[PDB]
Amino acid sequence: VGNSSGNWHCDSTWMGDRVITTSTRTWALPTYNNHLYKQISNSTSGGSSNDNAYFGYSTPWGYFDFNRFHCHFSPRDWQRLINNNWGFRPKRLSFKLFNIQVKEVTQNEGTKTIANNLTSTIQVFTDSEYQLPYVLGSAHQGCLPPFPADVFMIPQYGYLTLNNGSQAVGRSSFYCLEYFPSQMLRTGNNFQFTYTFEDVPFHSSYAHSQSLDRLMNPLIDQYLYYLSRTQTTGGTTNTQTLGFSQGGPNTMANQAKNWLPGPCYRQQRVSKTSADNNNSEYSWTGATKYHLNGRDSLVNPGPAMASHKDDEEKFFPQSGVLIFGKQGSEKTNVDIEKVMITDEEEIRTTNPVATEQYGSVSTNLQRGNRQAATADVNTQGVLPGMVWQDRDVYLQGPIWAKIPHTDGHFHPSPLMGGFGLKHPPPQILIKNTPVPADPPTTFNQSKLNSFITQYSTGQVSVEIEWELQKENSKRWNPEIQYTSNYYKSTSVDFAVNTEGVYSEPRPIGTRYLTRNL
Amino acid sequence: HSQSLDRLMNPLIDQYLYYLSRTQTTGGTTNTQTLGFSQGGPNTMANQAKNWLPGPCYRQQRVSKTSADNNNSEYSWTGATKYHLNGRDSLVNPGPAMASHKDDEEKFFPQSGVLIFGKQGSEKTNVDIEKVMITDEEEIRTTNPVATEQYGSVSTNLQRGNRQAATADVNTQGVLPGMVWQDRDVYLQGPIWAKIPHTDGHFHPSP
Amino acid sequence: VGNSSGNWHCDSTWMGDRVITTSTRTWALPTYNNHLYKQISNSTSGGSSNDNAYFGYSTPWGYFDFNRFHCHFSPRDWQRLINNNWGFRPKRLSFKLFNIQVKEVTQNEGTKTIANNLTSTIQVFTDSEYQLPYVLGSAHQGCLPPFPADVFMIPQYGYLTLNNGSQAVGRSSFYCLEYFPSQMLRTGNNFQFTYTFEDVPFHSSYAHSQSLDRLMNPLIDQYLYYLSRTQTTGGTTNTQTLGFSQGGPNTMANQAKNWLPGPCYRQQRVSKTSADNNNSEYSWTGATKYHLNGRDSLVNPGPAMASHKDDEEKFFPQSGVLIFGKQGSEKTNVDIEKVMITDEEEIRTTNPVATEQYGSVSTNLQRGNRQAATADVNTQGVLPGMVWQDRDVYLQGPIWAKIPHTDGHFHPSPLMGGFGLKHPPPQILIKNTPVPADPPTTFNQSKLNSFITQYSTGQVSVEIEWELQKENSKRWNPEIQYTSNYYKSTSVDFAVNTEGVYSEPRPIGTRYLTRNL
Ligand SMILES: O=S(=O)(O)OC[C@H]1O[C@@](COS(=O)(=O)O)(O[C@H]2O[C@H](COS(=O)(=O)O)[C@@H](OS(=O)(=O)O)[C@H](OS(=O)(=O)O)[C@H]2OS(=O)(=O)O)[C@@H](OS(=O)(=O)O)[C@@H]1OS(=O)(=O)O
Ligand SMILES: O=S(=O)(O)OC[C@H]1O[C@@](COS(=O)(=O)O)(O[C@H]2O[C@H](COS(=O)(=O)O)[C@@H](OS(=O)(=O)O)[C@H](OS(=O)(=O)O)[C@H]2OS(=O)(=O)O)[C@@H](OS(=O)(=O)O)[C@@H]1OS(=O)(=O)O
Ligand SMILES: O=S(=O)(O)OC[C@H]1O[C@@](COS(=O)(=O)O)(O[C@H]2O[C@H](COS(=O)(=O)O)[C@@H](OS(=O)(=O)O)[C@H](OS(=O)(=O)O)[C@H]2OS(=O)(=O)O)[C@@H](OS(=O)(=O)O)[C@@H]1OS(=O)(=O)O
Ligand SMILES: [Mg+2]
Ligand SMILES: [Mg+2]
Ligand SMILES: [Mg+2]
C-alpha cells in the first residue's frame, strides 16, 4: 500500500553471443461468467457437422497470450538480430506481475462510480506438470500488445476434450484449476517466478547460396554414366539401343546428385490477382485437407513447404502459408488489401513448391510391345537422402509451440514455424477473488451468485535470454540485408499514425544472410 | 488422450491468423474471383489453424462384423492390402501404424489391420467370428487416422480462370515433420516384446 | 492491509501409505438475529406434540459444516482411494481462515452501496473441552461446497436441551459462547490452529468373498451329526425315531457353522415402483420406530443392516438407508426421480436384511401329544458368535461423527456410517464484531440495538492426512472396480452442466475390492 512493487524494466541488450530482452507493459483483469464454469460443446455451435465438433468448458479464469515476437522485441532490434546472426534460440525466461489494483464498481441509476478495493486479492499459478490442455501454440489472438505504451485485457480460458460431435465420450476428462496451488496475492504484494528452456536446434535463420540441383562443379564431369539413349537415332530404324553419357557441363540436370528435396504435400495454386483464379468456390472443397475420425479438416496453416517458384509472385499456396491482417481487420471476408500474405520465395533451394507437382515415376514396366508409362507424383512421404528447412519466423507471428506428449513424434519442428519443446514454458492463469455480494440475513442452503463487478491491473515483466550465431562467412560480395526503404514516405514504417495507433508495414523473415548451403 | 489434434485449441478465442474462406464472391449471380479472408472462428474451428499433424497411414479394406454388410466376393487375398518383395508378394499386417475405425463404427474394422485371438478351443482354419476376439481400436481415434478410411485430399493440378480446380484424394501416405502418433496397444493375450533386425536403416523400431 | 495472508493450497497427494489432501474455498459471514440470542422451543413449533418437542436457543454466532467427503475429496481421487485400498482412517487435520474482508452496507432510499470497513474485526474460537452441544454429526446441510469454485455462507448456530415439550426442566442448561476465549482477528490478520485424531479401526472398505453360510469346504463332510429325522418315513406308521446325518455336500444348509449373523431390527419393505406398495399412509405409522420419554420417534436413518436380498432392487428398507437428492431438490414430497437412494446389495454376506425376517425359534416344548410349535423372529439382540460390518461411507454423505460422552457405550460405530471419537475434532464458531451504530448524544440506561449491516469473507483451509491399507490379495481373477461408464453421454458425470451448476450422477460406496472374508 505504502510501497510500489518493481520498477519498469523493459529494454534490450547485446552482450555478444547472448541477447537479453524483456517487455514491461500493463494489463487489466475482468471477471468472467460471474466466476462460473460452463459446458461449451457443439450445442453452442449452431451449424457445423462432425467437421467443427468441439466439447469443452469455460473456466472463469484467464491466461496469458505473449507467444509472439513483435510483442517481445522492438522492430529495430529484430532487424538487428536478423541482419547479423545466422541462428538463434531462447535460453532463459522470467516472469513478474505486480502493482496490482482492484477496483470495485457500483452502478447506481446508470450513474456508475469506480472506487478502489485494496481489501480484495487475486490468485494465480503456473502449470509445470503440464496437466492442463496446453492452449497457446494455437496462436490465438489477444497477444501482448505488439506495442509497449498500449495496455490490454487478458482473454478468458476454455478448453476442449474428445467428443462425438454434440456429445462427449466418457474418456472426456474434466478440469478445474481451482484444484491447484495459487499464489494468493493481495495488492502491494508482488509476484514472480522463474523458467528455463532446454536444448533445441537454432532456427536456421539463413538463406542458402546454392541448390540441390546445383551443388556440383561445372568445369568437370562425372566419371559416372547414365542412360541417355533409349533408342538409336541412327535414322528411321530407331531400334532399342543403349547409349550412355557422363556429367555433361550442359547436361547437369541429367547429372548425378547425392541428396534429395525434403518431403512434400500438393497444395492448390491460387493467385493474388482475381482474373487468374477459376470461378468456383473451392475454398473448402478444392482445398488440401486431411481426415480424422470423420472430422475432416484443413491441413495447414501449413505443411513443410516453399510457396512458389521463380517470378510467380501472383500465385501462392491456397492454405500453405500464413496470413496477417494489417492493423484494423474485421473477422471475415476482408480483402487482400488488408492482410499481409507471407511470400516464401526463399526456400526454393531445398523445399519444393506445394502448389507445384513434386516428381514423376514409372507407372508399370515398359517393354518392346507395350509402351513405357510415366506417372506423375504430387504427394510424397519422406526417405533417407532428404533434407529441408522448416517454416520461417515472422515476428508478426508465433514464437514457439507445444510438443504433444506422446510416443511417436518426428522432427517435432512446428508447422507454424518456431520452436517445439517436450517441456515448454508453462501457462499462466489468473482470476479475480470472488467477492460475494451482500449475503442473505437468514440462512440459505443454496450457494452464492451475487458478487461485485471488479477488476485489476498491473505490470507484466518477462526476461527472455537469447543465444545466437553470427555470420562468419567470407562472402566477398555484399550479401543482402533488410532495411526500411530509404526514400520519403507519408507515414514512417512501424511509426504511429497521427492517432497513436501504429501498425506494421510488412512482415519479416530471417533467411536473409547468404549462408553457403 | 483427453483431446484431439483437431481440437487442442481454445474455443473462446480466435486466431489472429487468417485463411482463404472466399474463392468467389457470393455477391449475386456474378460470383467473380475475389479474395475474402477470415480468422479462427469459434465455429469454423475446422478451418482453423493447427500446428501438428496425424501420424503416417496406409489404406486398409473396411470389412464388417455382420455378414450382409460385406460385398459378395473373395477378396480375402485379393482385395487385401499387401506389399511386394522380390516377387514374393505378401500381406502387410497383422498391422500398420493405425487406429481401427471412427466413432460408432463397431461393425467395421480393418480387414487385416488389427489382431485376432481365438477363444479357448479354436481349430486351425475357417473358424467363425463366434470364437475369436477381434481387437477394437476405437481408442486412438485421437492421433492416428483410420486405415479403413481415406487419409486426406490434395490438389490435383493447378486451377485457373479457364480450367477447373481439381481435388485429388489421398488414401496412402508417408511420414513428415509435424506428425505424431502412438503405436499399437499391448493386449496381454498377445506378444510382449519383439526383436529388432540388426541392420543400418531403421526408424522408430516400435513393433 | 498491504499484505495477503496465505496462498491457495488445495490439492491431493499419495505418498503411499498416507494421503494428504486439503480444500481451499471461500465463504461469507452474515450477521444474525442482529447479534441477539433467542429461546427456541416448541413455542415456535406450531403443531407437533411430545414427539417433535425441542427447547433451545439461537446464538447470533455461526459454525462450520465440512463434515462430508465430496466436499473434502474430488471425485477422481475418491475413485483412486476406493479402487485401490481396503481400509483407511484419518490421521491429522489443520485449519486456516484468512484474507478476511469486512464490508459495511448503507441503504439510502433503496439505493444501497457496499463499501469496505477494514476497521472492523471478527472473533472466532474452538471448543476443545467439548462443553458445547456437539452439533455436527447430525449431518445438517449447508456443508462445504462439494465443489471448489463455488462459495457459500456459514449457517447460524442453535442448540437444544432437555425439555418437557413446550417447557423446560431446571436441568435445562444454558450456554453463551461469548464466555469463551476468541481469537480476536482483524483483516490482514490470519488465523490457524491444529488438530490430531486418535486411533480408530479403519472403516472396512471392502466386500467379502464368501458368506457365513458358505465358508466351509464342499468336498468334505462334517464328522459331526445332526437331527435330520424326527419321524420314521418307514411307511404310514411314521413313529418318533431318531435318524442322524453329517455335513452333506448337499445338505450344507443343515450343516454345522461356528459363527452367526450380526444383530438386527425389522424394517418395513417398500419398493421403488408404485403399484407394489399397499395403499395406506404408514410413512409415520407402519414405520419402525422407538420410544423415549413419551417422545416417540423413528429409529434411523438406520440400524446395523443390509438393504435387501438378491434381485430385490425394487424393495428397500423404508427408513433403513440414506437418501440424497440430486442437485436441485426442494424441502418436501419430492419424488424418487430426484433423490439417490442407497442400495445395500453389498453386505448380504454378513448382515441380514432389515426388510426381512431374521430367524425362527421354538415356541414352547413339542411332545407326543401336543404339536411342535415354531415361532418367528423379526427383532433381535446381540450375542457372542455374531460378526457384522457397519454402514458404508457414501462420500455424498457424512465423514465422521461424535460419540456421546457417557459411561455405557458399545461398538460406538456410527449408524450414519463413518467414524466415532471420544474426543472428536472441535467445532468452529464465528461471528461478526458488533458495530454499534450511532449512539444517542445524551445518556441512556438501556443497551444498544442499532448496528451496521456488515459481513466478511475468506479462505477455508483444511489439511486432512490419511491412512490406508491397499489390496494385497492374490485374487487371480480381475476383481470389480468402479468406473464412469465408458460410453458416450450428453452431460459427462460429475461434470458442470453448461451452467456451471454441477451435480453427482450417482452415490458411491467403498466395499468394492473383493477381500476374502
Ligand atoms: O507377372 S506380372 O503380372 O507382374 O507381369 C509380367 C508377366 O505377366 C504378364 C502376363 O502374365 S502371366 O500370366 O503372369 O504370364 O503380364 C502382362 O500381361 C498380363 C496378361 O498378359 S498376356 O498377354 O497374357 O501376357 C496383364 O495382367 S495380369 O497378368 O497381371 O493379370 C498385364 O497387363 S495389362 O496392363 O493389364 O494389360 C501385364 O502385366 S502387368 O500388369 O504389367 O504386371 C506379361 O507381361 S508382358 O511382359 O507385358 O507381356 C509377363 O509375362 S510374359 O509372358 O513374359 O510377357
Ligand atoms: O508449364 S506447365 O506445363 O507446367 O504449365 C503451365 C503452362 O503450360 C500450359 C501450356 O504450355 S506451354 O507450352 O508450356 O506454354 O500447360 C497447360 O496446357 C498445356 C497445353 O496447353 S495450351 O492450351 O497450349 O496452353 C497442357 O500440357 S503440357 O504443356 O504440359 O504438355 C496442360 O494441360 S492438360 O491438362 O494436359 O490439358 C496444361 O499444363 S499442366 O498439365 O497443367 O501442367 C499452360 O497452361 S494453362 O495455364 O492451363 O493454360 C501454361 O501456360 S500459359 O500459356 O501461360 O497458360
Ligand atoms: O411345568 S410346565 O408348566 O413348564 O410344563 C411341564 C408340565 O406342565 C404341564 C402340566 O402341569 S403341571 O401342573 O406342572 O404338572 O404343562 C402343560 O399343561 C399345563 C396343564 O396341563 S395338564 O393337562 O394338566 O398336563 C398347561 O399349563 S400350566 O401348567 O403352565 O398352567 C400348559 O399348556 S397350555 O399350552 O397352556 O395348554 C403346558 O405347559 S406349558 O405351557 O407348555 O409350559 C405338563 O405338560 S405337558 O407335557 O404338555 O403335558 C407337564 O407335566 S406332565 O404331566 O408331565 O405333562
Ligand atoms: Mg500389375
Ligand atoms: Mg503436367
Ligand atoms: Mg408356560
Helix (H) or strand (E) holding A79: helix A75-84
Looking at A266-350, which runs of residues are DSSP E strands?
269-271, 289-290, 297-298, 315-317, 323-325, 339-341
Distance from CA of C40 to the nearest CA of A (A): 15
CA nearest to A26, candidates A45, A10, A41 = A10
> Chain B residue with minimal CA distance to A276?
B161
Distance from CA of C119 to the nearest CA of A (A): 11
Chains contacting A with at least 3 CB pairs below 8 Å? B, C
Nearest CB to A318 within list B10, B18, B20? B20
Pocket probe for ligand 1: among A363, A365, A367, A371, the residue whose CB has the most ligand atoms within 8 Å is A365
Residues of A in contact with B37 (CB under 8 A): 323, 325, 332-336, 339
Helix (H) or strand (E) holding C77: helix C75-84
Residues of C in contact with A120 (CB under 8 A): 101
Q: What is the DSSP letter of C75?
A: H
CA angle A7, A11, A12 (to 5 degrees): 150
A29's grid cell: 483483469
* CA–CA distance, B37 with A272 (Å, rounded to integer): 13
Ligand 4 centroid distance, CA of A385 (Å): 28
A358 within 8 A of A266, measured Cβ to Cβ: yes
* CA–CA distance, A135 with A154 (Å, rounded to integer): 14
- Resolution, Å (one decimal): 4.8
Ligand 1 centroid distance, CA of A365 (Å): 10
* CA–CA distance, A470 with A19 (Å, rounded to integer): 12
CA nearest to C1, candidates C169, C116, C81, C162 = C116
* CA–CA distance, C392 with C372 (Å, rounded to integer): 41
Q: How many domains does chain A contain in total? A: 1
| CA of C369, closest atom in ligand 3 | 48
Ligand 3 centroid distance, CA of A451 (Å): 82
B91's grid cell: 500381406
CA nearest to C481, candidates C504, C505, C515, C514 = C514
C139's grid cell: 449431518
Residue whose CA is at the smallest distance from ligand 1 atom 47 = A367
A241's grid cell: 539401343
Q: What is the DSSP track for C93-156?
A: EEEEEE----EEEEEETTEEEE---TT-EEEEEE-SS--S---TTS--S--S-SSSS------E
* CA–CA distance, C103 with A75 (Å, rounded to integer): 49
The burial of C164, by beta-carbon neighbours within 10 Å (0-12 exposed, 13-18 middle, 19 or more buried), is given as middle
CA nearest to A262, candidates A132, A95, A383, A413 = A383
**Domain that includes residue C200, residue range:** 1-517
Those residues whose C-beta lies under 8 Å from the C-beta of residue C446, and which sit 6 or more positions away, are none
| Cβ–Cβ below 8 Å for C101 and A123 | no
Residues of A in contact with C498 (CB under 8 A): 38-41, 43-44
C37 within 8 A of C176, measured Cβ to Cβ: yes
Helix (H, G, I), strand (E, B) or coil at B106: coil
Pocket probe for ligand 1: among A366, A367, A370, A371, the residue whose CB has the most ligand atoms within 8 Å is A370
Which is it for strands C207-208 and C514-515: parallel, antiparallel or unpaired?
parallel
* CA–CA distance, A353 with A309 (Å, rounded to integer): 7
C426 within 8 A of C64, measured Cβ to Cβ: no
Distance from CA of A42 to the nearest CA of C (A): 11
Four-point Cα dihedral A409, A411, A412, A417, nearest 10: -150
Cβ contacts below 8 Å, chain A against chain C, sum to: 165
C366's grid cell: 413339542
Q: What is the DSSP track for C4-46?
A: ----B---B---SSB--EE--EEEEE---TTT---EESTTTT-
SS3 content of chain C, % helix, strand, coil (to 5): 5, 30, 70
CA distances from C278 to C41, C132, C335 (A): 37, 45, 18
> Chain A residue with minimal CA distance to C109?
A108
CATH code: domain of residue C445: 2.170.30.10
Spacing of C-alpha A199 from chain mean position? 20
Those residues whose C-beta lies under 8 Å from the C-beta of residue A331, and which sit 6 or more positions away, are B14, B38, B39, B41
Nearest CB to B4 within list A162, A291, A380? A162
* CA–CA distance, C323 with C319 (Å, rounded to integer): 9
Chains contacting B with at least 3 CB pairs below 8 Å? A
CA nearest to C108, candidates C434, C457, C441, C453 = C453
Q: What is chain B's Cα-based Rg?
A: 22
Chains contacting C with at least 3 CB pairs below 8 Å? A
Strand partners of residue C196: C92
* CA–CA distance, C135 with B169 (Å, rounded to integer): 72
C69 within 8 A of C393, measured Cβ to Cβ: yes
Residue whose CA is at the smallest distance from ligand 3 atom 37 = C370
B122's grid cell: 479354436
Q: What is the DSSP letter of C272?
A: S
Ligand 5 centroid distance, CA of B124 (Å): 52
CA distances from A285 to A274, A279, A289, A330, B35 (A): 19, 13, 9, 24, 15
End-to-end CA separation in angstroms for chain A: 59
Q: Which amino acid is at A181?
A: P
> Chain C residue with minimal CA distance to A124?
C8
Residues with CB under 6 A from ligand 3: C 364-365, 367, 370
Looking at A116-274, which runs of residues are DSSP E strands?
121-126, 156-161, 168-169, 183-186, 191-196, 203-204, 207-208, 225-231, 240-246, 260-261, 269-271
Distance from CA of A392 to the nearest CA of C (A): 41
Nearest ligand to the C-alpha of residue C369? 3
Distance from CA of A29 to the nearest CA of C (A): 18
Helix (H) or strand (E) holding A76: helix A75-84
A99's grid cell: 502493482
* CA–CA distance, A31 with A37 (Å, rounded to integer): 12
Residue whose CA is at the smallest distance from ligand 2 atom 2 = B158
CA nearest to C101, candidates C115, C80, C86 = C115
